[PDB]
């Protein structure tokens, strides 16, 4: 009858679509960390609209019975590069810290499911299953990752691509895509809230900090903001409820990473000014780092400028 | 499709759709193909590209 | 579609080779030589249509 | 030999061309544990530049 009140394994199958790759050329390839181009976990609730991420906000646990990551080229055979991929089952064993490029690749053809292939053909990177009965939780990665993520797909580039005339290409280039056929088994019916649905965004605004003041007159120091989520896309706007006498000028600039939209300023003489907006995504540890440019003469500041953060609750974000 | 007008009803016991190329391997584009069985819910209404694929 | 219905049709790239055969009616009919004068079903035993996709 | 392209001219810039594996067999003898080389260079101050403003 109905109202079962029972827990049962439900095995499912399908195929999906990960993100397209983006091979690096020459003007974006000078370090070990450029050889690594996609760091992408292989959990369930880690995508948008794939039939495995949307289908996992309705159970609570999972276990990849057998998975495989399938590469498909989008290039002619007349182009030349070479890339390898491996799935590490210890998501906090990070290759972020290796410096010499050769060591970075030798620790990839050691994991027990690694492959190697040109970017003009196809091959399946399989996932390898621990010898236990462990069940991993769905949802966003909250405190520790060894509960949630069952693997991490690291694809990384060996060579540098090049045209038919041998001239190494300078810009980026799309070299195919990744699809992930899967078979997994879920256990506990419920709903995780972290991938909320559209028509429920709220635009929270209740976090009001304050910029630290300088000590000297001219300075371009920096500042960091903690307590934010490990990953999101925020926006800042200024906020000012103070007074002044002479100038009290200041000009904060965007954080020192990729995302940047504009600038922001503060200026409190008769030609007063308070405007700007910066967009960014917080680093994986859950903070950010700004840089300031202060050029006022008063030293007894005693009035730290206030700011604001706001975000849209629409999904994992 | 002329000889089906002599019977009201049908059902495909089997089908399949080959791709017979025309180019060499010096031209490249991933193209993806499928057969949807709800012939009313269509892809034309989507307005982005990452969800269409 | 009315070309891959006739019982001797082929398809091929223009960089390889293949033989298009002629198919023979099940009768003893003998066709006349010469120019096509009044009606063509006496003289011509076939018509080779090649066409580009 | 120098590099050559599709058309028989020399390439101007360097590049990477492949990779090298090592399919081995080996035999070890005496069980033990060798050290790990810990090394550190002392401090060294460098005041040998007169400035000007």
């Amino acid at each position: 009858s109905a109202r079962s009140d029972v827990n049962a394994i439900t095995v499912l199958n399908g195929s999906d679509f990960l993100t397209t790759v983006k091979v690096r050329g020459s003007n974006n390839l000078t370090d070990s960390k450029s050889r690594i181009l996609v760091k992408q976990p292989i959990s369930a609730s880690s995508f948008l609209g794939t039939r495995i991420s949307g289908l996992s906000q309705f159970w609570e646990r999972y276990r990849w019975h057998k998975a495989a990551v399938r590469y498909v080229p989008a290039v002619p055979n007349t182009l030349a590069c070479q890339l390898i991929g491996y799935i590490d089952t210890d998501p906090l064993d990070d290759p972020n810290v290796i410096l010499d490029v050769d060591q970075l690749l030798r620790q990839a053809t050691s994991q027990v499911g690694a492959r190697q292939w040109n970017f003009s053909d196809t091959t399946t990177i399989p996932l390898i299953v621990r010898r236990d009965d462990q069940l991993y939780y769905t949802g966003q990665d909250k405190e520790n990752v060894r509960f949630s993520q069952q693997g991490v797909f690291y694809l990384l580039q060996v060579t540098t691509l090049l045209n038919i005339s041998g001239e190494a290409i300078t810009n980026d280039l799309i070299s195919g895509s990744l699809y992930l056929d899967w078979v997994c088994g879920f256990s506990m019916p419920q709903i995780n809230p972290t991938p909320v649905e559209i028509s429920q965004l709220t635009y929270n605004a209740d976090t009001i900090g304050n910029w630290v003041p300088p000590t000297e007159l001219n300075q371009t120091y920096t500042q960091d903001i903690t307590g934010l989520k490990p990953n999101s896309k925020f926006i800042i706007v200024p906020y000012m409820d103070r007074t002044s006498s002479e100038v009290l000028q200041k000009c904060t600039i965007t954080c020192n990473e990729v995302n940047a939209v504009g600038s922001i300023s503060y200026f409190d003489t008769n030609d007063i000014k308070c405007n700007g907006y910066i967009t960014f995504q917080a680093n994986n540890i859950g903070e950010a780092t700004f840089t300031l440019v202060t050029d006022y003469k008063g030293v007894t500041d005693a009035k730290p400028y206030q700011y604001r953060i706001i975000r849209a609750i629409v999904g994992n974000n | 499709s002329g000889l089906s007008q002599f019977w009201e009803r049908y059902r495909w016991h089997k089908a399949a759709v080959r791709y017979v190329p025309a180019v060499p391997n010096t031209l490249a584009c991933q193209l993806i193909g499928y057969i949807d069985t709800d012939p009313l819910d269509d892809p034309n209404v989507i307005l982005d590209v990452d969800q269409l694929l | 579609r009315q070309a891959t219905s006739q019982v001797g049709a082929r398809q091929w790239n223009f960089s390889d080779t293949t033989t298009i055969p002629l198919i023979v009616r099940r009768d003893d009919q003998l066709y006349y030589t010469g120019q096509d004068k009044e009606n063509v079903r006496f003289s011509q035993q076939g018509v080779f249509y090649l066409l580009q996709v | 030999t120098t590099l050559l392209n599709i058309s028989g001219e020399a390439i101007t810039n360097d590049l990477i061309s492949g990779s090298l594996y090592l399919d081995w067999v080996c035999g070890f003898s005496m069980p033990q544990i060798n050290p790990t080389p810990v090394e550190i260079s002392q401090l060294t101050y460098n005041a040998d530049t007169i400035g000007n403003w």
Binding site: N77, T109, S120 | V20, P21, P24, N25, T26 | - | -
Partner: peptide, 23 residues
């Protein structure tokens, strides 16, 4: 003698990549 098997093997399989299939 005193030999663990299959420590870190690798297997390679070649293929080809013609210029046209011409089905």
């Amino acid at each position: 003698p005193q030999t663990i098997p299959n420590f870190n093997p690798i297997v390679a399989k070649p293929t080809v990549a013609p210029l046209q299939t011409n089905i």
